Ligand binder design. Structure first.
Ligand SMILES: Nc1ncnc2c1ncn2[C@@H]1O[C@H](COP(=O)(O)OP(=O)(O)NP(=O)(O)O)[C@@H](O)[C@H]1O
Ligand SMILES: Nc1ncnc2c1ncn2[C@@H]1O[C@H](COP(=O)(O)OP(=O)(O)NP(=O)(O)O)[C@@H](O)[C@H]1O
Ligand SMILES: Cn1cnc2c(F)c(Nc3ccc(Br)cc3Cl)c(C(=O)NOCCO)cc21
Lengths: 273, 308
């Protein structure tokens, strides 16, 4: 990918200040005139099969455009160096937004924000794209509008075990049972069902403005998540509303096949206060 | 507190040697060799020719909590007992928190076990005494709990002492770093895995599980096969689900005494309320035995691995 293969006309993009790190390279602010987010990755695998599947996925993201999904603009691969360029999201991550003292969440605002996220997840699923990393840090809220970030990015194979707590909360039991040292994240069973479970945790965050499990050890969270007992307890421990808790119990369903689709979840969010 | 004279004379000698070194930074040290990782290095200090052990952990986070971590960790200057490894200092440097400790001649009991193959009951009685004394000292004097008891954190020396390392003093370091790791093994109690409020009772379990691994030379869960016992590839959740939903390990009935078998059985009770506390464990028959026993620990250690 030479970036000239994309419908966004490109003469020059400039890197700007980095804006935080993560497991997936370094994200820089940048200017296309518009600001953009540029993620710099490295392929240690350097194996043609990794790049062929990479070329498959980035060409699929080319076909995406939706008001609740971040605009994928281009990607250029000069192996092993790769870069992914998306529209820059002004405003606050939904993670830091609900945790604000000043923020004013309510039974309506949470329903509205959640329906936006479901529309974006509906579109991505319609195009057969599994997000694989839906969480509150990957959802942006600027005034009215809500945008999903960092979708499909886990299908990449770039450069003991260490697992953040924030990520574990969004992970469905199917996934955490398969985690083991020496196993790469690319081999984990992400799915449309695993995505609606992560929507369960983000809805909980909309209600509780915190994690569903307090910062425990990874091992502690792994058992609680994978046994489904952890979500059983937090479901009973503090309640908010029967109608609100119904969608939370549905999304966190232990058997993935008993989890609703996103198109169904739009209707459930409608029959609310 | 049953403080022996020879122990109190070796405690004073290192507290007055603790001020001879004073403070330190990063250029005062120099590497020697690889101790291990989970990183810690054998180190030569140049102002004071004492050889020390420096463990380095790489943490790039906001500096506001790095300062809160260092000030919580300086309390280790107050923690001093013959069963806790000697603490020198703590400082941030190059974004790598470094802990300067006593060097222990025999390393960790994890290293000792791999070279020794198995650990005899006679001598596991002595380390068990040291741990309960070290855990009572920590719970009584500073009101903390260990949270990470395992053989690789039990350290021995040719001097004959026993002391534990890597105990949880900083609450911020727990929420910020230590919680995110998960090894191939788990030494965590069944009530901690289910996320209830755990106390030092959870540490008792860790001690019990650790004792079984040292006694048989194999990590106990899943329990060995029937014929595998005579001679002497698993995901992490199947490990943790076994600890919660399966019987706890037990020592083989043919090789070890009741006092030992019952000791670990009281340590490995799944319910922490029925599990033995430290008061009940200090007066347990297996402790009364080994405390009154006569073992030359330094002789076993140096002849097992080849030190002097
Ligand atoms: N499209 C975007 N617009 C603006 N900021 C972004 C965008 N994508 C990512 N960021 C920010 O870049 C930083 C790192 O993003 P990212 O690598 O996705 O990690 P994260 O989502 O914040 N948590 P994690 O994925 O676990 O590392 C964070 O501060 C994000 O808020
Ligand atoms: N203070 C110390 N003095 C001497 N040897 C030490 C010290 N700390 C660690 N070691 C050695 O370093 C190794 C253990 O290092 P460590 O970083 O503590 O990992 P671990 O104990 O194996 N598991 P973990 O502590 O949870 O990461 C063993 O070989 C120990 O003998
Ligand atoms: C969680 N947590 C909170 N405080 C801690 C602390 F002070 C530690 N170090 C330490 C403490 C006392 C003595 Br005596 C010697 C040492 Cl080296 C460790 C530690 O060494 N973990 O080992 C790495 C395993 O990931 C962990 C701590």
């Amino acid at each position: 990918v030479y970036l000239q293969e994309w419908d966004i006309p490109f003469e020059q993009v400039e890197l700007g200040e980095p804006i935080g790190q993560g497991r997936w390279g370094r994200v820089h602010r940048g200017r296309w005139h518009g600001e953009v987010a540029i993620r710099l990755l490295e392929m240690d695998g350097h194996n043609q099969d990794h790049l062929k599947l990479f070329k498959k996925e980035v060409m699929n993201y080319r076909q995406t455009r939706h008001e609740n999904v971040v605009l994928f603009m281009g990607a250029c691969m000069n192996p092993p160096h790769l870069a992914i360029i998306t529209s820059f999201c002004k405003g606050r991550t939904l993670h830091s937004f609900v945790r604000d003292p000043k923020t004013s969440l309510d039974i309506n605002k949470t329903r509205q924000i959640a329906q936006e996220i479901i529309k974006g997840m509906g579109y991505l699923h319609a195009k057969g794209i599994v997000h694989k990393d839906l969480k509150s840090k990957n959802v942006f809220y600027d005034n009215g509008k809500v945008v999903i970030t960092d979708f499909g990015l886990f299908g990449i194979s770039g450069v003991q075990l260490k697992l953040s707590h924030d990520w574990l909360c969004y992970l469905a039991p199917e996934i955490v049972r398969e985690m083991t040292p020496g196993k790469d994240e690319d081999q984990l069973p992400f799915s449309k069902a695993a995505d609606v479970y992560a929507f369960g945790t983000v809805w909980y965050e909309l209600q509780a403005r915190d994690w569903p499990l307090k910062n425990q050890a990874a091992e502690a969270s792994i058992w609680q998540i994978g046994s489904g007992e952890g979500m059983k307890r937090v479901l009973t421990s503090v309640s908010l509303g029967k109608e609100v808790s119904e969608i939370l119990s549905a999304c966190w369903a232990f058997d993935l096949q008993e989890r609703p689709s996103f198109s169904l979840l739009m209707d459930m969010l409608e029959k609310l206060p | 507190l049953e403080l022996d004279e020879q122990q109190r004379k070796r405690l004073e000698a290192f507290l007055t040697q603790k001020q001879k070194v004073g403070e330190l930074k990063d250029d005062d040290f120099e590497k020697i060799s690889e101790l291990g990782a989970g990183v810690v290095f054998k180190v030569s200090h140049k102002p004071s020719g004492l050889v020390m052990a420096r463990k380095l952990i790489h943490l790039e986070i906001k500096p506001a909590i790095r300062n809160q971590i260092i000030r919580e960790l300086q309390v280790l200057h107050e923690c001093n007992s013959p069963y806790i490894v000697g603490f020198y200092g703590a400082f941030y440097s190059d974004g790598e928190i470094s802990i300067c400790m006593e060097h222990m001649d025999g390393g960790s009991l994890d290293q000792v076990l791999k070279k020794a193959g198995r650990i005899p009951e006679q001598i596991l009685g002595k380390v068990s005494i040291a741990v309960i004394k070290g855990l009572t000292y920590l719970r009584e004097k500073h009101k903390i709990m260990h949270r990470d008891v395992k053989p690789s954190n039990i350290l021995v020396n040719s001097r004959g002492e026993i002391k534990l390392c890597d105990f949880g003093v900083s609450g911020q370091l727990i929420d910020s770093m230590a919680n995110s790791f998960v090894g191939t093994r788990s030494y965590m109690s069944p009530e901690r895995l289910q996320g209830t409020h755990y106390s030092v009772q959870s540490d008792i379990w860790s001690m019990g599980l650790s004792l079984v691994e040292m006694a048989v030379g194999r990590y106990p869960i899943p329990p060995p096969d029937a014929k595998e016992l005579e001679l002497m590839p698993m995901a992490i959740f199947e490990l943790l689900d076994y600890i919660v939903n399966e019987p706890p390990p037990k020592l083989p009935s043919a090789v070890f005494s009741l006092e030992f078998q019952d000791f670990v059985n009281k340590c490995l009770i799944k319910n922490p309320a029925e599990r033995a506390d430290l008061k009940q464990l200090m007066v347990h028959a297996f402790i009364k035995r080994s405390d009154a026993e006569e073992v030359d620990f330094a002789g076993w250690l140096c002849s097992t691995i080849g030190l002097n």
